[PDB]
Structure 1
Amino acid sequence: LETIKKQQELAKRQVQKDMGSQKEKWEKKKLEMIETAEASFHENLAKNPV
């Protein structure tokens, strides 16, 4: 019962201890910068042939 009560305490932390405010938005901003980089690379690949 004590080991399971300890797991519940550790479980509350694991959920809301490693939890950080604004996570999905930061991932979307990282994706946007990669999309712009790929867009610049395809333009450079268009300029090579042309």
Structure 2
Amino acid sequence: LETIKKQQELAKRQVQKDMGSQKEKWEKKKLEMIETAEASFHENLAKNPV
């Protein structure tokens, strides 16, 4: 039971550490930057045949 009790204390710490406020928003900003870079590359790819 003490070992199980210890895991529960760790469980609060795992959620508080791994999950943070606006975690998705930070990920979305990174995705938007990748999309903008990809859009610039696609225009360059379109340019080569023309």
User: TM-score range, shorter-chain basis?
Assistant: 0.7 to 0.9
TM-score (norm 1): 0.83
Aligned to 1:2: 2
Where does structure 2 lack aligned partners over 5 or more consecutive residues? Answer: none
Q: Deviation string for 1:25-50 (max 9, x for gaps)?
A: 01101110111111101100111111
Q: CA RMSD in A?
A: 1.2
Structure 1: gaps spanning 5 or more residues: none
Identity across aligned pairs (percent)?
100
- Structure with greater proportional helix content: 2
Deviation beyond 6 Å, 4+ runs, structure 1:
none
